[PDB]
Amino acid sequence: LDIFSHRLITQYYRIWRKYSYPATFEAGGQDKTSQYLLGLARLGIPGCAQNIATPVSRFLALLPLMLLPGRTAEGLTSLVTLLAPGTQARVWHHDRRRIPLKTPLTMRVHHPVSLKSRPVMGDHATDVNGQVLLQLSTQTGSEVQGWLPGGHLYSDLLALLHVYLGSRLDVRLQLCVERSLLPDARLSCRPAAGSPQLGRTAVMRTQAKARVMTISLGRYQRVQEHYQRKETQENGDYRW
């Protein structure tokens, strides 16, 4: 009857573990309870993790935020703070972007443009409802290198935005730090992840003339709006 006692004891401990969450953390979204939380975070469908390519368990730290229908600046601030505590950040709304036009504004007789369309000249239109600006600032070289293109903080932030903002809005990223924390632009016969970019970080060495320098980090965007329309062959056509 030793097995009777053994089995009952075993079940007791399993039952105890059942309701002790910390015990089951197992350094990742491996337990059912961890997955349950991810479910509430709208990440419960298998196969979705593969579209993120990050340690998805990271998002649990943001769980209370993901329960909201909107995505506030409070969220972006949290993302930056979480990844590299010490780094400060600020968010501006209605960041302006220029949008190319499909057609120029022209004058016609048969099918003229009505002012109800609020037309603009034919080269570019403005967009102040599609982007926000996320500005970062650090107090040490370590954090700076992490934020620069090729760094691990840069990558992680984009990995999180991928899910937190998704397709809702694009984010323009820039970093404001003392010149003394930036590298001297140098050439190389071979490119590298940490190599300075012409229009973002490639600051020239100063001849022993620190002020704060604003550099670009990049831009977050999920959908590239490329062209594969394949017009149409047929369509939904029920008269009802």
Binding site: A61, L62, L63, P64, L65, L68, E74, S78
Partner: peptide, 10 residues
């Protein structure tokens, strides 16, 4: 309050 980092201000 000592607002938790994970708390929502609203």
């Amino acid at each position: 309050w000592p607002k938790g980092d994970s708390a929502f201000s609203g």
